[PDB]
Design a binder for this molecule. Structure first.
Ligand SMILES: Oc1ccc2[nH]cc(CN3CCN(c4nc5ccccc5s4)CC3)c2c1
Ligand SMILES: Oc1ccc2[nH]cc(CN3CCN(c4nc5ccccc5s4)CC3)c2c1
Ligand SMILES: Oc1ccc2[nH]cc(CN3CCN(c4nc5ccccc5s4)CC3)c2c1
Ligand SMILES: Oc1ccc2[nH]cc(CN3CCN(c4nc5ccccc5s4)CC3)c2c1
Ligand SMILES: [Zn+2]
Ligand SMILES: [Zn+2]
Ligand SMILES: [Zn+2]
Ligand SMILES: [Zn+2]
Lengths: 358, 358
């Protein structure tokens, strides 16, 4: 089964990385153990959605393409290694983002930097190592592959887009005209930059390239199937589903119980440009806008409660339903367009959408 | 002249990166200005020793190889872009290291994260962007080059070695057997791991791969000259000169005036495994070892003063002279061995050594 293959490959790649640290980097057993625990704590525990998308896209093509059994095994192993490169890339950004944001919990456990024996001094570098491991995986496992060049180039572009998206996210509550490294940044008072187009830019870059575009294209590359698809359609469907995924996350930050969320959501306190805040400002009257401005971005729990009441009273569930209906309509249209050149790839996209939507 | 070409290429690469952010990443002018200032503040102001080594190695080969003038210009431009990849890689590690270490100043100015309009939340990501820019440079400028694969593979290996070296450095005052992410780390009390071999491991990985190996090998790659040298000799001379460079830095941290150093050195307070501490413990009597243990790794200025007195009284200048004489002897021996296959490359190494030694 796909998941068991994927998890077995994690143990293989971990053993390869740690054994290389011992044979080539002069590591001692205690530091190798620290790095093993860091890898497990930061890479494991999630749903493996991104990595398993690579595997599922590759399985779709195997079902319809003639190959010797050894070639089928090679392609699946490559899809698993590629999927772990994306999981380790995500692990890098979660470790760093948690330190940047001063976060407390991630997936029901303390953020890595908060572990007593880690601290920010080590965790920033541990995050650097996580992303370096993605490149060590690629050069080792894909050394003789025809797709190595395209895969590394895609991966770099996606990583850069993600870092640019993090910049857009962390500065989303500043007035753009005031940004200046030499001057402490005040929070926006007018919220003029909390618009659907600005929110779409943040989300497109901060999450959609690594959560949807990279796994789908990597599945095509390891399958040597990229010429069988219209790349512009793949980008459009990846950016569309990815935005919906971030809207779901934004709603959950505000209203999903902390036990289910795996943390205490603080987007209101952090003055984030969330879908809820943009959608609220898109329908609020003058008194509602004024109440929002007087309470948003404040740690005071009573102020956070005022904001959640404004969102609840504004009936944002109706705006979410209209948005969800439009996304269902557009994703189904793109899936139809993908069937022109590849019904197998269109089906993988339908699975990815179904898993996101539910 | 070499320096003017190198600086002109910085402006070209900066314009390329920022123009790409506008045409492909939807950046606005204010964020483009923030990134321009971040690039200038974190990449410029140093001696450009690493980047200029690439240029000097390439100039050496141009002097003895037949090429059309357009090819000479292409090779020099590539050497400048490669040199800036290494300068931006260093910029990434300085930004992150300063945050990890809680540093105050770097090159006579505040550390980047301390700028009022930056903060740790932005600076960690700015550091991530600096390293991503090295890959954008490579894929753009070297897209059609025969050396692209080897250059990217070398660069990844050097980056990984550096991150591993940072782990060795940050944990150098812990007892290895006590390292555990779940347990807050006490400082060593026995200093048994402050040995010449453990110090050599820290230094080899944390600085020598990116400061000496990477510039020398990159100069060979852009010149298509790597088969003209014995790679094992290049590694040995790079690791040897690089260690001497770090010993010089360690002595300067303790005894160079802050105005000349560009910061207030705090290796004693930070309990670093410095050359001074290892060399002191290698010659101290029992009472001197006990006094060192009672004062090292403490913020108290009177305790720091006791350590500097112990170092001064131990006549560490005599150990430095013996070490320096041994390094001069070994670097000259390796330069001689390099002349067997390439007198031009051996001369570049002699220049690199001369610039380091003085
Ligand atoms: O999650 C937390 C943890 C601790 C906390 N303490 C106080 C808070 C509540 N907010 C106070 C204001 N604010 C700001 N953000 C920016 C970003 C850019 C420019 C100006 C501002 S003003 C976010 C945090 C909080 C939240
Ligand atoms: O004032 C508060 C504070 C905390 C609270 N926790 C739960 C609640 C009660 N409802 C508030 C509104 N709601 C939403 N569901 C969606 C789904 C999609 C998009 C927007 C929304 S809005 C369901 C829960 C509540 C109220
Ligand atoms: O530069 C500074 C800035 C602020 C400061 N405050 C106090 C100090 C002085 N030292 C106190 C002890 N110490 C430790 N390091 C480690 C690392 C690993 C394991 C245990 C320890 S115990 C370094 C700092 C200091 C220095
Ligand atoms: O007690 C103190 C405290 C601060 C101080 N600043 C300057 C001093 C006075 N000398 C102390 C020793 N020295 C060193 N030069 C080298 C060079 C190579 C290797 C080891 C050393 S040791 C020169 C300056 C001093 C003393
Ligand atoms: Zn964040
Ligand atoms: Zn969120
Ligand atoms: Zn450091
Ligand atoms: Zn130093």
């Amino acid at each position: 089964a796909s998941m068991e293959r994927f998890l077995s490959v994690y143990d293989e790649v971990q053993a390869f990385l740690l054994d290389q640290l011992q044979s080539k980097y002069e590591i001692d057993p205690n530091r190798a153990r620290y790095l093993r625990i860091m890898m497990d704590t930061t890479c494991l525990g999630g749903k493996y959605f991104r990595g398993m998308t690579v595997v599922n896209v590759a399985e779709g093509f195997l079902a319809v393409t003639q190959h010797d059994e050894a070639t089928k095994e090679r392609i699946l192993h490559d899809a698993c290694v590629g999927g772990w490169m994306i999981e380790f890339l995500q692990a890098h950004y979660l470790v760093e983002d948690d330190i940047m944001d001063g976060s407390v919990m991630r997936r029901g456990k303390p953020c890595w930097y908060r572990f007593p024996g880690v601290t920010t001094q080590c965790a920033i570098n541990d995050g650097i190592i996580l992303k370096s491991w993605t490149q060590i995986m690629a050069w080792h496992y894909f050394a003789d592959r025809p797709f190595l060049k395209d895969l590394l180039c895609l991966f770099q572009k996606v990583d850069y887009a993600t870092a640019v998206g993090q910049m857009y996210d962390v500065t989303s509550m500043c007035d753009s005209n005031k940004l200046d490294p030499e001057v402490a940044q005040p929070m926006t008072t007018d919220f003029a930059e909390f618009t659907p187009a600005i929110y779409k830019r943040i989300v497109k870059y901060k999450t959609t390239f690594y959560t949807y575009l990279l796994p789908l294209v990597m599945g095509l590359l390891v399958s040597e199937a990229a010429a069988s698809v219209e790349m512009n359609l793949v980008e459009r469907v990846a950016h569309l589903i990815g935005e919906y995924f971030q809207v779901q996350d934004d709603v959950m930050d505000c209203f999903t119980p902390p036990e289910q969320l795996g943390k205490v959501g603080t987007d209101i306190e952090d003055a984030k440009c969330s879908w809820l805040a943009v959608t609220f400002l898109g329908k609020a009257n003058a008194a509602q806008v004024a109440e929002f401005k007087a309470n948003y971005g404040e740690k005071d729990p009573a102020k956070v409660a005022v904001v959640k009441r404004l969102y609840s009273k504004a009936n944002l569930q109706a705006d979410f339903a209209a948005y969800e209906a439009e996304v269902v309509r557009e994703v189904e249209s793109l899936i139809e367009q993908l069937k022109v050149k590849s019904p197998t790839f269109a089906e993988s996209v339908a699975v990815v959408w179904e898993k996101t939507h539910k």
